[PDB]
Every structure is written in C-alpha cells, then in structure tokens.
Amino acid sequence: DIQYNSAFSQLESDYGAKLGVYAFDTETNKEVAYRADDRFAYCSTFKALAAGAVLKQDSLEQLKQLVKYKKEDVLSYAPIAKDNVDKGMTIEEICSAAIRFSDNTAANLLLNHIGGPKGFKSALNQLGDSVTQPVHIEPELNEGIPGDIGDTSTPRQLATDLQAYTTGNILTEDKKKILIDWMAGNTTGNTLIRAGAPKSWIVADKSGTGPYGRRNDIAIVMPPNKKPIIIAILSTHDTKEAKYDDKLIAKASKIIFDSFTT
Amino acid sequence: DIQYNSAFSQLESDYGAKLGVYAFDTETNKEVAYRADDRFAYCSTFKALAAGAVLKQDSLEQLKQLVKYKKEDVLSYAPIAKDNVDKGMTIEEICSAAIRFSDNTAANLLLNHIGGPKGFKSALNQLGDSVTQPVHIEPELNEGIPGDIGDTSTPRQLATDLQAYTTGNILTEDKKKILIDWMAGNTTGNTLIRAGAPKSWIVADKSGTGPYGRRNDIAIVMPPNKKPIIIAILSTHDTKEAKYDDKLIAKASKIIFDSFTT
Numbered sequence: 001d002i003q004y005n006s007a008f009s010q011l012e013s014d015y016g017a018k019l020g021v022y023a024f025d026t027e028t029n030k031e032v033a034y035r036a037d038d039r040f041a042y043c044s045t046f047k048a049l050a051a052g053a054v055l056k057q058d059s060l061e062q063l064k065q066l067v068k069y070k071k072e073d074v075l076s077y078a079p080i081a082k083d084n085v086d087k088g089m090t091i092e093e094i095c096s097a098a099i100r101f102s103d104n105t106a107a108n109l110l111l112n113h114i115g116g117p118k119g120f121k122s123a124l125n126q127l128g129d130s131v132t133q134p135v136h137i138e139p140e141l142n143e144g145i146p147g148d149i150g151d152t153s154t155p156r157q158l159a160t161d162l163q164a165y166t167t168g169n170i171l172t173e174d175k176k177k178i179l180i181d182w183m184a185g186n187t188t189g190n191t192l193i194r195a196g197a198p199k200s201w202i203v204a205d206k207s208g209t210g211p212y213g214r215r216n217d218i219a220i221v222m223p224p225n226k227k228p229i230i231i232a233i234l235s236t237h238d239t240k241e242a243k244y245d246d247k248l249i250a251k252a253s254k255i256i257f258d259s260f261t262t
Numbered sequence: 263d264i265q266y267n268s269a270f271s272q273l274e275s276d277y278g279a280k281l282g283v284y285a286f287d288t289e290t291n292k293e294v295a296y297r298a299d300d301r302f303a304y305c306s307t308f309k310a311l312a313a314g315a316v317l318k319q320d321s322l323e324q325l326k327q328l329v330k331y332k333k334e335d336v337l338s339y340a341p342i343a344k345d346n347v348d349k350g351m352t353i354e355e356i357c358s359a360a361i362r363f364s365d366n367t368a369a370n371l372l373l374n375h376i377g378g379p380k381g382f383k384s385a386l387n388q389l390g391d392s393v394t395q396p397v398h399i400e401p402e403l404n405e406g407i408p409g410d411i412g413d414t415s416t417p418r419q420l421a422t423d424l425q426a427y428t429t430g431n432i433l434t435e436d437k438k439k440i441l442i443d444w445m446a447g448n449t450t451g452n453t454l455i456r457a458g459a460p461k462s463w464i465v466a467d468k469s470g471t472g473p474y475g476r477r478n479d480i481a482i483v484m485p486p487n488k489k490p491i492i493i494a495i496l497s498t499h500d501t502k503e504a505k506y507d508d509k510l511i512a513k514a515s516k517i518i519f520d521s522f523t524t
C-alpha cells in the first residue's frame with residue numbers, strides 16, 4: 001500500500017535513517033511491509049528468539065537448573081548477572097534477565113545453553129529460518145560493519161520467527177505464556193513499539209541497540225478481543241557514531257497500528 | 263543355522279522355559295536368532311535404553327541437574343535412592359543407580375525425566391522402534407500377564423535399540439562412552455551374559471527379572487581388537503511363581519559366543 005510507504009519514507013528522510021518494517025495482523029491476515037526483506041543487524045532482539053529456543057529444547061523442570069559462572073564472564077552490561085556469581089542463576093532467571101534487562105552475560109549464558117551461536121542457528125534452521133545468521137556472542141554481535149551478513153536478519157524473518165514461538169505450534173500453551181510474560185512489562189520497551197501503541201493493546205517486546213545508531217524492536221501486540229499483531233522494526237544509520245532517536249520507532253509503530261485499524 | 267537351534271531348544275527343554283535370543287556380531291555382520299521376533303516382558307532391561315534416551319535428549323551439562331523427590335517415591339527396591347531423599351540426586355546419578363543396581367525409584371525418576379512411559383515410547387518411536395511398547399512405571403512394568411503387549415519387546419528389537427545407542431549415530435562419542443560405562447562392571451550382570459563370555463571379551467549389560475520366572479539380559483560385548491557384539495536374551499516360564507535359573511542365560515550366551523567364534 002502506497003499510503004504507508006510514503007509515511008515510512010518520510011520518517012527515513014526526517015531521521016536520516018534506514019528503516020525496515022514487517023508487521024502481520026493475525027486477526028485479519030494483513031501485513032505492513034517496508035524494506036521487509038533487507039538485512040539489518042538484529043542486536044539484542046535475538047534474545048527473545050533464543051529464549052524461545054530454550055523453551056523448545058528444555059522441559060519445564062529443566063528451566064530450574066542452576067548455572068554457575070565466573071567473574072570473567074561478567075560483561076560491562078550485566079545488571080543481574082554481576083550480582084549472582086556466588087550463588088548462580090537458573091535457566092529461567094537467565095532468560096528473564098536477557099529479555100527483561102538485555103543483560104549481556106545472561107544472554108551469553110543463554111547462548112551457551114543452546115549450543116552457542118552455532119546451536120542457536122541450528123535451532124532457527126529447524127524452525128524453517130534459513131535467513132537469520134547468528135555468528136557472535138556478546139558483545140561483538142551488535143558491532144558488525146554494514147554489509148556483514150553475520151548477526152543479521154530481515155524484518156520479515158524476525159517477525160516470522162517470533163510469531164512461530166509466541167502463537168504457532170512450536171511451543172506448548174504453557175511455554176508460550178512463559179515467553180510472552182518474559183517479554184511483557186519491561187521498561188526497555190517503553191519508548192519503542194509500546195510508545196506508539198494504543199493504551200489497551202498490550203505490547204510484549206524485545207528492544208535492541210548498537211553502533212551505527214542501530215535501534216530495533218520486535219513485539220507481539222495483543223488488542224482486546226482480537227488475535228495478536230506481530231511486529232519487527234529495525235533501523236540503522238550510515239556512520240558508526242550516529243545517534244539514534246527512539247521516536248523513529250514509536251512513530252513507525254503508530255503508522256503500523258493506524259494501517260491495521262482502518 | 264540348525265546347530266544352534268537344536269542347542270537352544272535343548273536349553274528350553276532342560277530348563278522348562280521359553281527362550282528368546284538375538285545377537286548381532288558387528289565385526290562380521292552375522293546374527294544368531296532364536297524366537298527373535300517373539301514378545302517377552304523386558305523387565306529392567308529397559309533401564310539401559312531409557313538412559314540412552316536421557317543422553318539423546320539432554321546436553322552433558324543437563325546431566326548435572328539436581329532432582330528432589332519425596333519419601334513416598336521410595337519403592338521397596340531402591341538401594342541408592344532411599345538414602346538421598348534429603349539431598350536429591352543428579353540426572354547422571356539417577357541413570358547410574360537405575361543401570362548399575364536396577365534401583366526402581368531411580369528408574370521412575372529416569373522415566374519422569376523423559377516424559378513418563380509415553381515419553382520413553384515416543385523416543386523409541388523416533389529411533390525407528392515401533393515394536394517396543396512401554397506402558398507402566400515401576401513396579402508394575404514387570405508384572406504383566408503372559409500375552410500382554412504392554413511392557414514387552416522382542417529380542418531383535420531390544421538388541422537393535424541397544425546397538426543404535428551404543429554404536430550407531432544416535433549419540434555423540436562421549437555420550438556413547440558414558441552409557442557403556444554405566445553398563446560396565448556391575449555385579450547384577452555377573453551370573454548372566456558375562457558368565458558365558460570369554461574372560462577378555464568385556465561385557466556391559468543390563469539384567470532383568472520378574473514373576474513367571476522371567477530372567478533377561480541385554481549387552482554390548484567387546485572382544486579385543488574387534489568390533490562389538492550386541493546381544494538380547496529374554497526368558498520366561500508358564501506359571502507366576504516359577505523359579506528362574508541364571509545358568510539358562512549363561513549357557514545361552516556360551517552358545518552365542520561359540521557360534522560367532524568358529
């Protein structure tokens with residue numbers, strides 16, 4: 001549709017950024033797609049998908065397994081894991097810290113639990129995703145130069161994978177609920193898709209950030225009385241030290257919701 | 263071959279028992295088969311296969327997960343688990359106790375870890391076994407009446423499954439070694455296949471016993487400098503209170519080894 005294309009292109013001009021959008025409304029089977037098959041560095045958005053992979057791999061009781069790690073594993077952004085070296089963290093605590101706070105040590109422990117980047121890639125391939133290309137752990141995974149394929153995916157692919165874990169048949173009902181609750185109600189989401197959403201449409205998201213002014217958000221959005229909307233919004237700039245502005249994401253989200261509520 | 267058929271039939275007459283034998287020599291691709299496709303109650307032999315299923319399901323680190331259980335789970339034969347109610351047991355400790363000592367509480371914890379009898383059946387089906395029919399947990403699983411299909415398999419099928427876990431491509435090299443070591447050097451095996459084996463041919467087995475004078479043994483046998491032999495010997499009697507005699511199994515084993523060393 002040409003109305004939203006113009007609005008997204010205007011955002012690109014206004015913010016000096018490249019924007020990639022894919023949204024799918026499962027109530028109506030409509031989509032919004034803008035550079036939906038272009039690659040972007042996914043940054044921390046992957047943490048929600050890797051937690052999906054944990055849930056698929058593991059029984060519910062395996063989520064209680066305690067993991068011990070060392071001070072050397074504590075990275076410069078590890079707001080939960082830096083305080084749990086002595087006692088350890090369980091798998092579910094690791095997934096929560098990675099999704100709710102984007103803790104990078106928790107994200108590395110999560111990746112270790114599913115076999116490293118190569119194991120995460122294998123899990124995505126088993127789901128039918130041959131586009132997403134995990135290569136690195138934290139902190140390198142958001143630092144790739146433009147043009148790398150490693151640590152990238154497309155808006156469409158990320159949305160498709162999130163839809164598979166949160167609404168498809170990959171996970172049991174109870175595991176879907178665990179994942180969605182991990183993604184719900186976290187402050188890291190406040191300025192992004194949630195900022196552009198209607199107040200009663202519940203947003204459960206995972207944000208991402210990186211150099212090149214990268215700023216991303218993926219989400220499941222749940223309107224009252226309707227089936228959910230799945231969204232991926234990825235964005236980047238040309239130069240490594242560029243600033244990002246979260247309003248780009250919030251405004252892109254408002255365009256998506258307006259397009260689905262006509 | 264008609265020579266071993268006569269010898270096995272003579273054992274049946276001598277002991278008043280029904281004997282089922284399947285052995286496969288992977289060095290030479292020869293077999294010994296006697297009622298190999300008849301069903302028998304497998305009794306505790308399954309514990310080795312269920313431990314295979316644990317290894318396939320779980321990462322190496324998941325074997326260290328601690329499991330807590332209650333006094334009510336402690337059965338009348340639980341020589342290891344009865345002493346670990348307070349502190350718990352890890353998954354690898356559970357698999358060891360089930361295989362080395364035939365602990366029935368450990369076997370139930372093992373079954374729980376792979377989804378109950380139905381989960382164990384699903385794992386065997388994924389391996390290509392559509393014959394073995396797990397139904398019960400301990401202690402009921404060895405108590406079925408003759409003619410039940412539940413909790414039965416055939417000599418051929420049990421040997422085929424043991425071969426898949428211990429020598430096939432189901433498990434990594436390290437996991438194969440864990441399984442074979444769990445099965446090696448346990449006293450419960452001393453009077454059975456090991457009693458009929460040459461002294462330098464290393465036997466790693468899992469025994470079984472039940473009412474109807476049921477007495478079974480499955481094993482991987484490793485001659486020096488050669489590829490292994492996989493064996494299942496199952497036996498039963500007609501009446502519930504019948505006694506068994508381990509020499510039936512040891513003598514059947516000697517027939518197998520003589521047949522393979524001509």
Ligand SMILES: [Cl-]
Nearest residue numbers: 065066327328
């Ligand atoms: Cl644990």
Ligand SMILES: [Cl-]
Nearest residue numbers: 076077078079
């Ligand atoms: Cl921190």
Ligand SMILES: [Cl-]
Nearest residue numbers: 080096097100
């Ligand atoms: Cl948390």
Ligand SMILES: [Cl-]
Nearest residue numbers: 056170171172
């Ligand atoms: Cl699942």
Ligand SMILES: [Cl-]
Nearest residue numbers: 194201202203
């Ligand atoms: Cl919200």
Ligand SMILES: [Cl-]
Nearest residue numbers: 338339340341
């Ligand atoms: Cl006991």
Ligand SMILES: [Cl-]
Nearest residue numbers: 342358359362
């Ligand atoms: Cl033990």
Ligand SMILES: [Cl-]
Nearest residue numbers: 318432433434
């Ligand atoms: Cl494996």
Ligand SMILES: [Cl-]
Nearest residue numbers: 456463464465
């Ligand atoms: Cl031996």
